[PDB]
Amino acid sequence: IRWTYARSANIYPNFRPTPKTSLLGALFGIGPLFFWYYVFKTDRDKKEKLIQEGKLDQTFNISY
């Protein structure tokens, strides 16, 4: 019971905002989101540009 309480319900009351905690939170909670956004935005921009130029060969792509 003590282990479960320590793992689950005792994390926030002992939490303090420190440079290490703040930096880790910002990184691990923001960096992946913007990384994936940049990757997908670049891929979709490239695909849309190829579509506008018409050099994509979208034949038989009926289902979408």
Partner: protein
């Protein structure tokens, strides 16, 4: 809307004479049934508060609650219908009296109208 200053209004009349020109609500109106249901709920709550058998404590009291609620609901529905009829009548009269402010739209067909197309990709 502010129909308080509408000309020719009797200051303290619940139902003007002209309101008799409209069809009265049917006695089986769903809203009247809802007022009856509200009366029955009030009767049940009254029985519950007094610590009495809720379903079957006072049949006369529950009947009186239902009847009073139905009566007031009927008259309230008549007044509501009259007020809405007045609003529509004023709307139509004003739109007829001011043709300049409500011009007839030049009817158009979808064939000669260009709507931009945004593909989903």
């Amino acid at each position: 809307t502010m129909m308080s200053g509408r000309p020719g209004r009797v200051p303290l009349q619940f139902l003007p004479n002209e309101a008799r020109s409209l069809p009265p609500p049917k006695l089986t109106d769903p809203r009247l049934v809802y007022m009856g249901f509200l009366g029955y709920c009030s009767g049940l709550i009254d029985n519950a508060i007094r610590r009495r058998p809720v379903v079957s404590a006072g049949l006369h009291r529950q009947l009186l609650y239902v009847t009073s609620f139905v009566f007031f609901g009927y008259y309230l529905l008549k007044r509501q219908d009259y007020m809405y009829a007045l609003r529509d009548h004023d709307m139509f009269a004003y739109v007829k009296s001011h043709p300049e402010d409500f011009p007839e739209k030049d009817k158009k067909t979808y064939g000669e109208i260009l709507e931009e197309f945004h593909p989903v990709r």
